[PDB]
Design a protein around this nucleic acid. Structure first.
Lengths: 167, 129, 165, 60, 210, 173
RNA sequence: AAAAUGAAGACAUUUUAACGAGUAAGGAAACGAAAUGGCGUAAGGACAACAAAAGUAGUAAAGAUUUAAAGUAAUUUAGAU
RNA sequence: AUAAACAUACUUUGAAUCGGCCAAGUCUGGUAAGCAGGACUGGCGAUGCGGGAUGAACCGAACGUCGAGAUAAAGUGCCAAA
RNA sequence: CGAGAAUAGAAACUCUUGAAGAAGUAAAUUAUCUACCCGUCUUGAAACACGGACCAAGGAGUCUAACAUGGAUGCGAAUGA
C-alpha cells in the first residue's frame, strides 16, 4: 500500500444544473460550451453559478440593481437568480439579465424603459461579457441562519427554536 | 471477425453453507456475521463476488456466437435490428406460439437475421415425418 | 490524584530563583510596552495580586492593549481539538520583553542599510549592491587543500582496558 | 463491577484527524476591552473622517 | 511551420555538449588537485557530497507519528520508493530520524542517468506522466531553463540553482526489489544490515533495483 | 575483512586544526571502517562528525600475499564478568585473513560476537615467539604429518551423485 | 480527478493519471458528462405490429422439474418434459 | 529547508460509540500473578495474507480479478520449495 | 572516421490439427495443495457459552400528528386559501 493522507472522494462542486428542468439543462450546456471554447472567466463564473442549489442562488431586488448600477449607465446587470421587486422604491432605467423575473418586477423594469433579458440573449449579445455587472444576492439574510449553533453560548448565541413554553 | 471473449471466473459464487443446509439456497448473499469465516476472507474460504471479476466492456453480454441477444415477439420486432444483423441475433420469446414462430423464422431468413431459437416448438416431424 | 486548586503543583514553578528573592529590577517597571510587541509571561510569585494562571507561564504572547497599570497580552491556548485566543491583562511585574525576533530585526536592519545605499548609488549611476544572502542550513563543505608544512599525525587506536579500582 | 477509570489512549490520534483548528485573523483584531481613551480617540477621528467624506458626496 | 522541430534539436545538442563540459571540468579539477597534493606532500580534502538518494525500505504499518510526517515530507510514501534529497544540516538530521525506515547514500552520475531514463516521470496537471520526449520536458520545466532530459540529469546531479523546482516536478521513482541486506533490514548497514546510510555503496543496491 | 587507512581532523575551538588522526581499521567495507574510526575519535578525543571532516579513506593491501607470517593480535573483549585483554597468535599470509581468523575463533571459543571485540594492535612475531600449544607444532622446519581418513575429493558439483555404485572407501590420501 | 467532445451514437462517451482491506455506521429518488450503480415481489396509470385489426396466448398461459446461455452479483434469458 | 490545488477553510444535518484488551530498552500497589491501575506510541478489536509446527495482539507486510519477474520476515537432510 | 542537412533504396511468411468433433465450458471420479459451526453477546468462540433435528408457508422501523434541516418545484413582499 501507499501512505496517503486521504483517499479519493467526490469533489463537492456541482458541475451541472440540478433537477430535471429542460431549459436550465440547456443553459448549462450553452455556457459549458462557451466556458470551454472562449476560455473566458466570465462564462466559467456563470456556468458555476448555474449549478448552485436554489438556496445558494438568492434573489436580488430591483433596489439592489438600482443602487449597484447608478455609476454604470450603459451597462447590463447579470444576476443568476430570480429578480424580485422592491415596491418601496422606484425603478430606474437599466438592462437586467436573470433566470427569472417577478411579474411585478418585469412590469416595473419595462415601464421605466429598461429591458428584462434572459441568459440566451446575453450570451448571444455579450458572450464573453463586455458591458456586464455581475451581482449575487445576500446569503446571510436567511432566517434559518439565526438558529445555527448553541443558544447558551456567550459570544454568538443561536435563536432558540420556538416550541413548548417559549417565553 | 470475432474478438476473444475472456471470462475471469467461470464458476458460480455459491452462497456460504449452501452445500450443507437445504434451507439455504445457492443464490449469493453477503455473510454479515461477526465471526463469519468467509467475510473475513480466511484461507480456503476467500471467494466473494467483487467488481474485479467484471468482464471486459468490449465483450460484455456477448453470446458465444459473437452477437447480442435481441428478444423478439412478432415479425415487426425483426425490423428493429435488420440494419444491425452483424451485431444482434434474434431470440423468440418463450410464450410465442409455434405458428407465429414460423413467420419470425421465415422473415428472419429474408432479412438475414440470425435466430437462436430456430429449432424450438417444431412439430411432430422428427421420426417417420 | 492531584487536587483542582488554582495553584496546584507549584512548589517548584512558583519558587523564586536561588539568591533571587525580594524586590525585582526597576527595568521591569520602566520598560515601555507598545501594541504589537512580543512579551514573555513569567508568573512572579512574589506579587500575589494579579498573578497570571500557571498554564500561561513561559508562553510568548503579543501586546494588544496598554492600560495605566496592566499590559494586555494575547496568547494561543490549546483546547480539545482547536486553538483559542486568550486575552489577559497582566501587570509589568509578570511579563518580560521577548527576544524571539532579535535575529530577525537585525536582518531587517541589514537589508535596509543596503537599500539605503542603493537609492543613492542609483543617483550617481554606479552599480547597486545586492541584498544579503538568505540563511541556509549548514551546507556541505567544499574541497580544501591542507599544507603539509605544519602538520602532525597522532595515531588513534582502541585502548587497552585498565581496571578503575 | 469495577471499571477502568481513565485513559488518554487514542486521544492524540483523535485530536489530529481534523487537526488543531487555528483561530482566524479576525480573532486577533478584536477591540473589546481596549483602553478607554484610545477608543475615545479612535472614535473621534473616525467620526471626523466619515463626516468629511459625506460632505464631499453631497458636493458632488 | 515544423522548422521549430529542427532548431529545437540543435539546441538540445548544444546544451548536452555544454552539460558534459561542466561535469568533465569539475572531475578535471578534482583529479588535478589530488595529483598536485601528492607532489608537495600535502593533504587534499574531498568535497562533501551534495546529493542524496533515499529508498524507503519498510512498509506503512506501525510507524510513529513523527516518522510518518517526515517520510511524507521526503515523498517516501511507499516501500521501494526513491527520491533525490539535497544534503544540508536540515535534511541530514531529517534523514537520521527516519533511519530505520529508509536506506540512502550518494548517487553517481550513472545512477542518476539510469534512474531518470528508466523510472523518470513528471507531475503534469496532477498526472504522473512518464518521460517520453523532450517536448514534454520543455512544457513543464522550460521556464527553469531546462528543455531536455540532459539538463534534467545535469541539474539534479550538480544540484543547480533550480533543484527545488526541478526535483519537485520529478515524481518519486518506483523501483523493483533486490536483496536488501546481509543479515536483515532490522539493523544498520554498518552492523551488516539494510537500513541507514550506505554512502557510495547505495549504487550497488540501486543497480539491482532499477 | 579489509584494511583502510583513514585520516581526519577537527575544526573547532577545542582542537587545533593541525592535529591529524590516523588509524588502520579492519572492516568488511569502507562505510563500516569510517564508522569504527568515528567511534574512536568520539570516545577518545571528543571529536564528532559534525565538527570534523574526513581527509583520506583508502584500502591497504598486503605487500606480499605469498609469504607465511606469524601474526600476533592484541585485543580486548567484553564478557559477563568484565573486560579482558587477550593475546592470540595466528598463521596466515595476509593481515586481513588473520583478523578474519581471530573473529571466527573468538566467536567459537569465547562465544563472543563481533560487536564486543576491539582490535588494539596486530604485529608480526618471530618463529619462536609462538606460544599457542597447537600452533607451535607447525612452526618448525620439519613439520610432517600423514593426513588419514580422507574423504575422496569430488572435482566439481557435476559429479556429485546421490547414490553411487559399489562400495565406498576412505583414502590414506 | 483533469482535459476533449457532446442531441442521442452507447457499453453511463474519449484520453491520461492516481487509487481499491474493513466491524458499528453513512451514502432516499431525480439531476449529459448525471451529488454511488443496480436485481427481485405485488397492485395502480400509461405505453407495446403506425398504412383502418396494433404485446403474447388451445399451433398451448401461469406454475413445477431439469439443461444451457448472459451477468462480478442480486438475477435474467431460452430449450425439453 | 522540505512538502502541500482532487491544497486549504469550512457550514449544516445526522449515525454509531464512550464494558475495551495487548506489546514494551516505562511507572505505581502487591511476594507475585495470564493481578489492579496509569504516561507516550504502535496494534488487536474492525484484519485477511507470508513466517514463528499450533496461537486476537510477535515478525514481514495490509487485500479489485490475473500473468511474468525481482524480493520481505525467515529458511535450504526428509516431511517441505531451496 | 564522421552528427545535422540534402540525395536514393531494399517486409509482407510456412507447417500440424479440427463435424471421424478443434478451442472452451459444465458434470462425476481420482490425485497435489487447500478448508474448525453458523447466528449472537463479547476484550476475546471452533469452543466444555447460548439458539439451531428437517422442510414449506407466515414473520419484525409502519401509520397519524407537531417541529427542524436538506435536495427538486410554483409564486415572491407576499405565499396558501
Amino acid at each position: 500500500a501507499i501512505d496517503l493522507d486521504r483517499h479519493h472522494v467526490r469533489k463537492h462542486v456541482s458541475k451541472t444544473a440540478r433537477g430535471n428542468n429542460a431549459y436550465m439543462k440547456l443553459l448549462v450546456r450553452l455556457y459549458g460550451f462557451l466556458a470551454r471554447r472562449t476560455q473566458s472567466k466570465f462564462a466559467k463564473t456563470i456556468l458555476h453559478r448555474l449549478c448552485l442549489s436554489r438556496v445558494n442562488r438568492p434573489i436580488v431586488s430591483t433596489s439592489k440593481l438600482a443602487c449597484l448600477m447608478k455609476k454604470h449607465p450603459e451597462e447590463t446587470a447579470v444576476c443568476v437568480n430570480t429578480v424580485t421587486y422592491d415596491s418601496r422604491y422606484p425603478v430606474p432605467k437599466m438592462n437586467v439579465c436573470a433566470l427569472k423575473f417577478t411579474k411585478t418586477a418585469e412590469a416595473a423594469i419595462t415601464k421605466a424603459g429598461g429591458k428584462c433579458l434572459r441568459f440566451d440573449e446575453l450570451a448571444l449579445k455579450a458572450p464573453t461579457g463586455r458591458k456586464t455587472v455581475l451581482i449575487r444576492g445576500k446569503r446571510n439574510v436567511r432566517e434559518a441562519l439565526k438558529h445555527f449553533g448553541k443558544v447558551c453560548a456567550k459570544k454568538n448565541p443561536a435563536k432558540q427554536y420556538k416550541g413548548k413554553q417559549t417565553k | 471477425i470475432k474478438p476473444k471473449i475472456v471470462k475471469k471466473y467461470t464458476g458460480h459464487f455459491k452462497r456460504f453453507d449452501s452445500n450443507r443446509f437445504l434451507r439455504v439456497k445457492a443464490s449469493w448473499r453477503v455473510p454479515r456475521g461477526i465471526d463469519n469465516r468467509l467475510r473475513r476472507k480466511f484461507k480456503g474460504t476467500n471467494l466473494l463476488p467483487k467488481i474485479g471479476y467484471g468482464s471486459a466492456k468490449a465483450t460484455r453480454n456477448m453470446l458465444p456466437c459473437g452477437l447480442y441477444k435481441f428478444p423478439v415477439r412478432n415479425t415487426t420486432d425483426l425490423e428493429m435490428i435488420m440494419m444491425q444483423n452483424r451485431k444482434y441475433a434474434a431470440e423468440i420469446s418463450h410464450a410465442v406460439s409455434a405458428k407465429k414462430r414460423q413467420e419470425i423464422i421465415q422473415r428472419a431468413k429474408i432479412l438475414n437475421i440470425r435466430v437462436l431459437n430456430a429449432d424450438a416448438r417444431i412439430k411432430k416431424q422428427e421420426v417417420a415425418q | 490524584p492531584l487536587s483542582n486548586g488554582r495553584n496546584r503543583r507549584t512548589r517548584k514553578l512558583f519558587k523564586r530563583p536561588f539568591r533571587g528573592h525580594g524586590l525585582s529590577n526597576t527595568s521591569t517597571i520602566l520598560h515601555t510596552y507598545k501594541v504589537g510587541d512580543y512579551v514573555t509571561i513569567l508568573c512572579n510569585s512574589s506579587i500575589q495580586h494579579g498573578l497570571p494562571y500557571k498554564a500561561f507561564h513561559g508562553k510568548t504572547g503579543r501586546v494588544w492593549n496598554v492600560n495605566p497599570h496592566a499590559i494586555g497580552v494575547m496568547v494561543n491556548k490549546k483546547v480539545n481539538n482547536r486553538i483559542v485566543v486568550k486575552r489577559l491583562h497582566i501587570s509589568p511585574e509578570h511579563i518580560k520583553p521577548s527576544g524571539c525576533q532579535k535575529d530577525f530585526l537585525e536582518r531587517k536592519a541589514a537589508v535596509a542599510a543596503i537599500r539605503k545605499q542603493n537609492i543613492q548609488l542609483k543617483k550617481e549611476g554606479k552599480p547597486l549592491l545586492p541584498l544579503p544572502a538568505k540563511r541556509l542550513p549548514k551546507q556541505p563543505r567544499p574541497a580544501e587543500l591542507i599544507k603539509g608544512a605544519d602538520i602532525k599525525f597522532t595515531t588513534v587506536a582502541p585502548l587497552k582496558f585498565e581496571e578503575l579500582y | 463491577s469495577k471499571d477502568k477509570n481513565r485513559s488518554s489512549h487514542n486521544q492524540s490520534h483523535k485530536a489530529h484527524r481534523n487537526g488543531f483548528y487555528k483561530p482566524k485573523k479576525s480573532a486577533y483584531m478584536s477591540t473589546k476591552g481596549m483602553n478607554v481613551q484610545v477608543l475615545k480617540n479612535t472614535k473621534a477621528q473616525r467620526k471626523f473622517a466619515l463626516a468629511k467624506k459625506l460632505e464631499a458626496k453631497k458636493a458632488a | 511551420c515544423k522548422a521549430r522541430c529542427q532548431a529545437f534539436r540543435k539546441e538540445v545538442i548544444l546544451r548536452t555538449i555544454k552539460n558534459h563540459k561542466d561535469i568533465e571540468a569539475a572531475k578535471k579539477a578534482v583529479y588535478t588537485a589530488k595529483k598536485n597534493a601528492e607532489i608537495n606532500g600535502d593533504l587534499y580534502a574531498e568535497a562533501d557530497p551534495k546529493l542524496i538518494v533515499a529508498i524507503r525500505i519498510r512498509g506503512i504499518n506501525g510507524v510513529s507519528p513523527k516518522i510518518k510526517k517526515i517520510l511524507k515530507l521526503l515523498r517516501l510514501r511507499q516501500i521501494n520508493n526513491a527520491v533525490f534529497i539535497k544534503a544540508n544540516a536540515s535534511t541530514i538530521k531529517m534523514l537520521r530520524l527516519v533511519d530505520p525506515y529508509v536506506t540512502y547514500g550518494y548517487p553517481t552520475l550513472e545512477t542518476v542517468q539510469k534512474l531518470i531514463y528508466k523510472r523518470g516521470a513528471l507531475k503534469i496537471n496532477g498526472n504522473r506522466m512518464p518521460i517520453t520526449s523532450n517536448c514534454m520536458i520543455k512544457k513543464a520545466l522550460g521556464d527553469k531553463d531546462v528543455v531536455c532530459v540532459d539538463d534534467l540529469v545535469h541539474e539534479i546531479y550538480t544540484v543547480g540553482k533550480h533543484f527545488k523546482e526541478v526535483n519537485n516536478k520529478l515524481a518519486p521513482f518506483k523501483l523493483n526489489g533486490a536483496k536488501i541486506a546481509e543479515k536483515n533490514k532490522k539493523i544498520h548497514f554498518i552492523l551488516g544490515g539494510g537500513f541507514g546510510n550506505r554512502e557510495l555503496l547505495i549504487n550497488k543496491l540501486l543497480a539491482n533495483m532499477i | 575483512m579489509k584494511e583502510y587507512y583513514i585520516t581526519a581532523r577537527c575544526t573547532d575551538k577545542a582542537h587545533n586544526p593541525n592535529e591529524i588522526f590516523r588509524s588502520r581499521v579492519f572492516a568488511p567495507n569502507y562505510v563500516v571502517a569510517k564508522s569504527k574510526f568515528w567511534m574512536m575519535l568520539k570516545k577518545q578525543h571528543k571529536v564528532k562528525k559534525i565538527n570534523a571532516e574526513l581527509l583520506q579513506c583508502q584500502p591497504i593491501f598486503e605487500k606480499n600475499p605469498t609469504v607465511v607470517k606469524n601474526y600476533q593480535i592484541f585485543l580486548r573483549y567484553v564478557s559477563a564478568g568484565g573486560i579482558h585483554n587477550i593475546t592470540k597468535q595466528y598463521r596466515d599470509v595476509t593481515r586481513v585473513g588473520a583478523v578474519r581468523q581471530m573473529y571466527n575463533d573468538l566467536a567459537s571459543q569465547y562465544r563472543t560476537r563481533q560487536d564486543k571485540i576491539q582490535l588494539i594492535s596486530i604485529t608480526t612475531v618471530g618463529d619462536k615467539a609462538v606460544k599457542n600449544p597447537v600452533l607451535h607444532q607447525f612452526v618448525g622446519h620439519h613439520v610432517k604429518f600423514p593426513m588419514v581418513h580422507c574423504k575422496p575429493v569430488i572435482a566439481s558439483k557435476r559429479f556429485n551423485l546421490p547414490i553411487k555404485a559399489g562400495k565406498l572407501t576412505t583414502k590414506l590420501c
